[PDB]
Structure formats: structure tokens, C-alpha cells
Amino acid sequence: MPAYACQRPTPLTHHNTGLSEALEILAEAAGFEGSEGRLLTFCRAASVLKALPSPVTTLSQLQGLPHFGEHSSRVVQELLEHGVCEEVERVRRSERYQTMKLFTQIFGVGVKTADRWYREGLRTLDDLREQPQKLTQQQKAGLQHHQDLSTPVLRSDVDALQQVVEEAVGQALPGATVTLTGGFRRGKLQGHDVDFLITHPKEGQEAGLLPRVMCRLQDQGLILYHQFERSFCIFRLPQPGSWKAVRVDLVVAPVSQFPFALLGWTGSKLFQRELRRFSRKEKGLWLNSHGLFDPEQKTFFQAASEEDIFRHLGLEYLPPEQRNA
DNA sequence: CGGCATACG
DNA sequence: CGTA
DNA sequence: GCCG
Ligand SMILES: O=c1ccn([C@@H]2O[C@H](COP(=O)(O)NP(=O)(O)OP(=O)(O)O)[C@@H](O)[C@H]2O)c(=O)[nH]1
Numbered sequence A: 001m002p003a004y005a006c007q008r009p010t011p012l013t014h015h016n017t018g019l020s021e022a023l024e025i026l027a028e029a030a031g032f033e034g035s036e037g038r039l040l041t042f043c044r045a046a047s048v049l050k051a052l053p054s055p056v057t058t059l060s061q062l063q064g065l066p067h068f069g070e071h072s073s074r075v076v077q078e079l080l081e082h083g084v085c086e087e088v089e090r091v092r093r094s095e096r097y098q099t100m101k102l103f104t105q106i107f108g109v110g111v112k113t114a115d116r117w118y119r120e121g122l123r124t125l126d127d128l129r130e131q132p133q134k135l136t137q138q139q140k141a142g143l144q145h146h147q148d149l150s151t152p153v154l155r156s157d158v159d160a161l162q163q164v165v166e167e168a169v170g171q172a173l174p175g176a177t178v179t180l181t182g183g184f185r186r187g188k189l190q191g192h193d194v195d196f197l198i199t200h201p202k203e204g205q206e207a208g209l210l211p212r213v214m215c216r217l218q219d220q221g222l223i224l225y226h227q228f229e230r231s232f233c234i235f236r237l238p239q240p241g242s243w244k245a246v247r248v249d250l251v252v253a254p255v256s257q258f259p260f261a262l263l264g265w266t267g268s269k270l271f272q273r274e275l276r277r278f279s280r281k282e283k284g285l286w287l288n289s290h291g292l293f294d295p296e297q298k299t300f301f302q303a304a305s306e307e308d309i310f311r312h313l314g315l316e317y318l319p320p321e322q323r324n325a
Numbered sequence B: 001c002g003g004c005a006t007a008c009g
Numbered sequence C: 001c002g003t004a
Numbered sequence D: 001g002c003c004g
């Protein structure tokens, strides 16, 4: 079991679901308290369990697994012994966890904003609504549409959205392409949003594309909210006899950078963080969604594929459905 | 102990 | 600050 | 919280 998540296949469904979900509760809680280091360790330990070929049944099976020290092991131990971990349950019940979770789930609200509101005594969504003076227009959108946005996006939702995005993209720039990314590209059956990557086979033609796409989407009455090369929108998605609000992210990249952007936006989030960490610390190369940079030779690696990028980094290729760290 | 991904809106 |  |  290698120490970086990008070094091992991590399937979407696995054999330690309960254990990983408990550790991810502690990761989340760590983030609510600003402790990014602890969040990372708990996320990594959870991911290690996702990568195992069978259930963890005894404590000794944790020996020699990366990212399992005294704390994470004790969490697993209690779950194995009693089916629950007191620390985890304590977090679950806490007013702090529940309110920070509720608040950060709002589009436009991050840990810093949630925390401030919490300290001001705010607890509920109606607490925010009954004082819209303090809200940004983004937060007002997030709050108005919160119920719909809390509803899982389904695969059938995605196909319908892709068609309408392709339609607008097609008028905006003939020959431009739309690629499904994010969680659904990794095989997820549900999602919190739909993520699309847009490019054109002729380098440079993609310049200026996103405002033209956005203009045409808005013209068809499909945009409930939007604010460039990235756009975080709320779409009006038809439903039987009605509609619902759905979060949709659009990203444009030149075709030269397409593999890097495909890699970066397909995730998982932890997978990308680990991959970038691996790149910098183990290979001395700087990776982002634009490219891979050798800071010694002052050169960018050209990639024609995600496979190229894994090869560059000396990693075995992992298809998207094995990047579910 | 230092480090913990990386960028755009 | 928010977002991915 | 854990690695190196
Ligand atoms: O902090 C972040 C967030 C997101 N991302 C990258 O953006 C992708 C989409 O970001 P996302 O927030 O849409 N997450 P996703 O994996 O689609 O799952 P879901 O919650 O169902 O939407 C992720 O899969 C990562 O590649 C990051 O690199 N960093």
C-alpha cells in the first residue's frame, strides 16, 4: 500500500464503507475548525481503506498501512469492537458540526463565513433569510435554491443537461466540444452538480468562448444564476410538469491544455491534491490544471492524453473510475 | 520539526 | 472572500 | 494527524 492515493486504484464502491465514512466525519470536523493538516490525514486514512481489497475485520490488519497512527487506529478499533466510535458520534451530535455543515453546504458560503455566522449566534437557514442584509447575491442565490441544490443530481439529469450545453456551445463556436467531467466521469450515479469541460480542436479558437456560451444559455431562459474561463452556474433543469435548479460548472481550456484540465477536473479532489503533492515532492515537477512544469529546465511538458501525464510522472495509468480517492 | 494542491471569479 |  |  503506497503512501500517495495517486499510486493505487481506488474504486467508487469498496469493502470498508462504514470505516471510511467515520474517518471522513472527523476530516470534515477538522476542516470546520481550520485544521487542514488533520483534515488531510483523516481523508488519506479513509482513502487507504477504500483501496483495500477486502473488509478490515481486526486491528492488526492496520499495521503497516500508511496514515494510520494512534488516532485513526483507535477510531477503527472502537468501530470494530462496538459498531460505533464515541468521538465520531460526539461530533455528529454537536451543535457546531451540524450548523457548520448546514451553513457550508450553501453555495456562496465557505468555512470562514459559516464560522463567523456561527459565532454571531446564527443557527438555521431561516436565521439567514430573516436578515438578507448580510448576504451576497451569490449567497442569496444559494439560499433561495438551497432545497433543490440539496437534491442529488441523477445520471438522467446529466444527459439532458449535456445536450443543452452542446447546443449553446455549438452556436457559440462551431466545432467546439463538450466533455463530461467531475464525479460522473468517475462513474458516480449521483452528484452535487454537473461538471463540463469545453475546448476546440484548433488552438486559440476557444479564446472568448465562455461569455458567448453564457449569453446563449441565458437567452434560452436556462440560467437561474451565474456571475472568464470558469463559470459556476445554477441551471433550470426541466422535470415532468415543472423544473428544478441544478448546479452546473463550465470550464474552457485550449486543446493544448485539455489533458491537464480533463485530469484536474475529473478528480477526485483528494486524488488531485495527492497527485500534485506526488508530482512536486517525489518528481520535482509542478502540476496544475493547465500543465506540468519542470522548474529546473523551465519547460512545460506537452501532453496529448491523460495517459501521457501519468507516464510523465512515472505512475501507472488509472482510469477515472479508479481515481475515487 | 516542515509540510500538507492549485488556481480562477 | 467565494468557487472548482 | 501523520510522514519522512
Ligand atoms: O477543492 C477542489 C474542488 C474540486 N476540485 C476538482 O474539481 C472536480 C469537480 O469538483 P466538484 O466540487 O464538482 N466535485 P465532484 O468530484 O464532481 O463530486 P460532486 O460533489 O458529486 O460534484 C473535482 O473532482 C476535482 O477534480 C479540485 O481540484 N479541488
Ligand SMILES: [Mg+2]
Pocket: A182, A183, A184, A191, A192, A193, A194, A195
Ligand atoms: Mg461535480
Ligand SMILES: [Mg+2]
Pocket: A182, A193, A194, A195, A249, C004
Ligand atoms: Mg463542480
Ligand code: NA
Pocket: A103, A104, A105, A106, A107, A108, A109, A110
Ligand atoms: Na458553500
